From a paper:
The obtained charge density map, characterized by the overall resolution of 2.87 Å according to the “gold-standard” Fourier shell correlation (FSC) method, revealed [name] bound to the ribosome. In comparison to antibiotics of smaller molecular weight, such as ERY, which binds at the same location but only partially occludes the NPET, binding of both KLB and [name] results in nearly complete obstruction of the NPET. First, three azoles (Thz3, Oxz15, and Oxz18) are involved in π–π stacking with nucleotides A751, C2611, and U2609, respectively. Superpositioning of our Eco 70S ribosome structure with bound [name] with the structure of Tth 70S reveals that residues His69 of the Tth protein uL4 sterically clashes with the [name] molecule rationalizing why [name] does not bind to or act upon the Tth ribosome.
Here, we report the discovery of a new LAP BGC in the genome of [name] Similar to KLB and erythromycin (ERY), [name] induces expression of Katushka2S but not RFP, indicating that [name] is an inhibitor of translation. The newly discovered antibiotic [name] represents the second known example of a linear azole-containing peptide with a known mechanism of action and mode of binding to its intracellular target, the ribosome. Although the [name] and the previously described LAP klebsazolicin both inhibit the elongation step of prokaryotic translation through the obstruction of the NPET of the large ribosomal subunit, the mode of binding of [name] to the bacterial ribosome is significantly different from that of KLB.
Numbering used by the authors:
A (entry chain CC): 2 to 272
B (entry chain C3): 1 to 46
C (entry chain A): 2 to 23
D (entry chain CU): 1 to 93
RNA sequence: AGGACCGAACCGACUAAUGUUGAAAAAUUAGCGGAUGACUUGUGGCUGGGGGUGAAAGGCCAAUCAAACCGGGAGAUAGCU
RNA sequence: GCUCGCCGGAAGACCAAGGGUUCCUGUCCAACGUUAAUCGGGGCAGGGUGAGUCGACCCCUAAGGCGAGGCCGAAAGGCGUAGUCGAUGGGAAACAGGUUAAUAUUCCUGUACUUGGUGUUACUGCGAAGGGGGGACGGAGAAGGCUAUGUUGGCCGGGCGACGGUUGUCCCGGUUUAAGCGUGUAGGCUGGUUUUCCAGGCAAAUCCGGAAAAUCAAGGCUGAGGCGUGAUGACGAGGCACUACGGUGCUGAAGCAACAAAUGCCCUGCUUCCAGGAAAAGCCUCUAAGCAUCAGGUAACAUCAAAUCGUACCCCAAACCGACACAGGUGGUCAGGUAGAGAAUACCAAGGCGCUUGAGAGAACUCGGGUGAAGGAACUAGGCAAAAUGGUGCCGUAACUUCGGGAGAAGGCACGCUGAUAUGUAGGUGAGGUCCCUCGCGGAUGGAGCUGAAAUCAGUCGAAGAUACCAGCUGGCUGCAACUGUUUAUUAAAAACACAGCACUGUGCAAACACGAAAGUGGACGUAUACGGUGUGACGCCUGCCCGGUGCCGGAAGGUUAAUU
């Protein structure tokens, strides 16, 4: 669970770390690793397009299965592994033909559990089946949006999507944000919550803990000059504007959804 | 103190050398002006 | 040349240093 | 490695520079001046087909031209190529 | 164990004095801060001017920066000297 | 040439970068050298850089670059797939001695090693751009084994002292030796082997992975260093004849041990932590197309080949960057003695220097220091600057506190040399001898020799024993900022910026947003416990009332309202 740090120095006084002793204390599975070089927030023009990104620890990418193509073939979990690419943990599972794959680790899953994908699997956490074969009212995760595309909804550390209705070729989903959303019923999804529900309980304690995740410091706009940010200068602390982005678009209340081709999919917006 | 010019032959030839000027339209126009002026050295290159 | 040397002129003498490169 | 026109174009000059004489009487090494593109095989083939002697090995170095000046003008001598040809035991020169 | 303590290399620059046609177009001497980290450094690479980059001072972008430098418009214009 | 002085974690030695003949020798002193110059990094001329193993070139890739086609853009052009480049990384092999005025892992002597082409005897299943394994990797810490290296003893050579003494338990010097080859050790990883099947590895596969029986417990990989050979050699303190003073042809003694010991090696190990730690080839292994007494591979030996470029010299500097023979700047490696915790510091060794104007005199004043009666901050904007404190062990230590701190609070005691406990103790290392053995780089018993802290008692010297160098001033009240950090390169280091935390707001993914005429890329190979923006700034207690103004969100009734007709 979460453990306090004793304040033997400033910068340890407020640290809370999430300890999971059942994670694998060894090197990851080398056939499922690739290279993952940092961008620093730079695109192919070499420009900072997203601010406050850069530095941080080296990472290797873990190829996690989101599609879950291996229908019918049973799989046993070998072990839970730490993944630096996401807020959840992952699970090296072992199929019965000798193929090893990483998946998202759900809530109660440990080493030795039986998982199975496909159309006629069981109903237990870890199994992946289409949403036209699931009892209406259950909490799901790793939810696809197109049939075959790969799971995109509820991938985080402790999130879940609850199926609330079925009509036509569609099921209605109460997303984790508070939004009712119609998805097709050929889209696969995986039972149970994804399992790292104490991830939000950590407090980083110090500035270097944010710096070794690749988060550079954020300068307030009101600390800048008028040429730099619309929140300008002034003698002393003056604000005197309405709060906007660095590009003059009004923040703190102004909606920015303009898509108009996915309005046939949204029953109710979030709150 | 530490000065402006810290020389390096690889960076000099990758920045101002002949293949770098010939690689683009504008460096070829620079070499065209340096031939129209009568310069003995088009680029640095040595 | 370029050392500056006055509090504020374009070029005077002065033993200070923000005004002064001839 | 060999054709006779190239072998007649390889060698230029016997080199006499008071390390050449020490190398002749100490290490059985004659010191020659060769062309700027002559490889070791061409020098060895030219020494055997042109001096009638038999060669252990050929070592080569490139001598870099020295700068000599007059006023605002600076000239440079040519680069040349020195060879150390080691004979087996017997020799004429 | 620790953005832990003291302290050399190393990275900085808090105070004083010297120097100010300097040994130096920003240093020297004596003390001084950090010194396992948000550290520092070699080498290569990318971002280009109303643009970049900025733990943000309008700071830095080749001793130049409230808009670099070079060439051109160009013999701009100047009721001013 | 002899004395003196300075550096000695550098002001010594070797390189990379950069420079480009400054290297060595002869000759010259007009100009250059902040003086003179016979000298020189200066003029003139000549000489000097030798490689299958070192580096480059080469094979392979990272960030990134170019990019057939392709997509997009008035044009120029942009982005990108296949590819092809791109080291700062991965990949074959050589050391020791000597020698030139100037080159050396390159030349010579001795001893080696690696990879290709081709030839001969045999064993035969060979084949790639594809499959698999490996290459292949983080921070920190701790222990063990060593070695470089040093010290002492033994031995060998030389010395018996310009002035009291020096045949002694005295003085000075030397006591060095590599790669390769064999051994496979201290350790570290690992459970091996056979047979049968398979929805996995783009197709296949004897390979990898999975599953199941049978058998067995020693099998394989890795790995410092030690030892033997290498070595009947080389080097080596000193001597034989000579000399053109600078040495060369010549032999050449001992060349042993024990202890201490790295930041180096085993070690890319082991443990532990979260922040979860390159790629691809060489290498091994498996087959598709193709060929099967041929071709191809494998074990052994012979034979040929290993090209081309760099190599001088400087390289914390008078040779690079700074206009200068400029108190500046500049990455890596080597890292001795005594005292010390130490790469601090002090004195020294090897080695290198005395910094390219001197000679005097000994005014004011300026700079850098030393000391100072009595008073002791009276100075001044202000204790600025100086003075002062300063080390190890031990005793002791307040308010407050977030229970960690405060704290090295404050404050104080001992400290040198000699003798004894003990001809040198506890501890550390560890020979000879006895026995056992899966028989060696072993295990017990052992304890010599070597090294050696701190303590206690007594004595004794001085004014002073942390004697030099080195080396905290301390306490009390209070503002701001929680803190470590960051910042106006060159007048401002701060109460500013950041910060962990908190909140509000947007964002349902082909996301919001950003860069871009666009294609597209970042966000992100992430998915609302995530991401972008904005404000406040740890933590404790809290965060009140106002929606009339402006903004934002919601609503659609009515009015007003553009292009169009």
């Amino acid at each position: 669970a979460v453990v306090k740090c004793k304040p033997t120095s400033p910068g340890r006084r407020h640290v809370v770390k999430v300890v999971n002793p059942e994670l694998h204390k060894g090197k990851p599975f080398a056939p499922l690793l690739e290279k993952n070089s940092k961008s620093g927030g730079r695109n192919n023009n070499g420009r900072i397009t997203t601010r406050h990104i850069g530095g941080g620890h080296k990472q290797a990418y873990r190829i996690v299965d989101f599609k879950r193509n291996k229908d019918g073939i049973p799989a046993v979990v070998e072990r839970l592994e730490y993944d630096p690419n996401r807020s959840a943990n992952i699970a090296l599972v072992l199929y019965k033909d000798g193929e090893r794959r990483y998946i998202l680790a759900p809530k109660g899953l440990k080493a030795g559990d039986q998982i199975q994908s496909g159309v006629d699997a069981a109903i237990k956490p870890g199994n992946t089946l289409p949403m036209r074969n699931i009892p209406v009212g259950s909490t799901v995760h790793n939810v696809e949006m197109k049939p075959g595309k790969g799971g995109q909804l509820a991938r985080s550390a402790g999130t879940y999507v609850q199926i609330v209705a079925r009509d036509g070729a569609y099921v209605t989903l109460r997303l984790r944000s508070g939004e009712m959303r119609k998805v097709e019923a050929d889209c696969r999804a995986t039972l149970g919550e994804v399992g790292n529900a104490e991830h939000m309980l950590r407090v980083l304690g110090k500035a270097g803990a944010a710096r070794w995740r690749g988060v550079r410091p954020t300068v307030r706009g009101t600390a800048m000059n008028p040429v730099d940010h619309p929140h300008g200068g002034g003698e002393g602390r003056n604000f005197g504007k309405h709060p906007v982005t660095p590009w003059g678009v009004q923040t703190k209340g102004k909606k920015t959804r303009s898509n108009k081709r996915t309005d046939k999919f949204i029953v109710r917006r979030r709150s | 103190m530490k000065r402006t010019f810290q020389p390096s032959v690889l960076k000099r030839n990758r920045s101002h050398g002949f293949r770098a000027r010939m690689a683009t339209k504008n460096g070829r126009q620079v070499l065209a002006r340096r031939r129209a002026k009568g310069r003995a050295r088009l680029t640095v290159s040595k | 040349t370029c050392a500056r040397c006055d509090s504020x002129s374009r070029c005077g003498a002065x033993g200070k240093x923000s005004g002064x490169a001839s | 490695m060999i054709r006779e026109e190239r072998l007649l174009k390889v060698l230029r000059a016997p080199h006499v520079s008071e390390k050449a004489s020490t190398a002749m009487e100490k290490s059985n090494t004659i010191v020659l001046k060769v062309a700027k593109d002559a490889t070791k095989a061409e020098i060895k083939a030219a020494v055997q087909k042109l001096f009638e002697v038999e060669v252990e090995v050929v070592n080569t170095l490139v001598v870099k031209g020295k700068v000599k000046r007059h006023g605002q003008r600076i000239g440079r001598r040519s680069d040349w190529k020195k060879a150390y040809v080691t004979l087996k035991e017997g020799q004429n020169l």
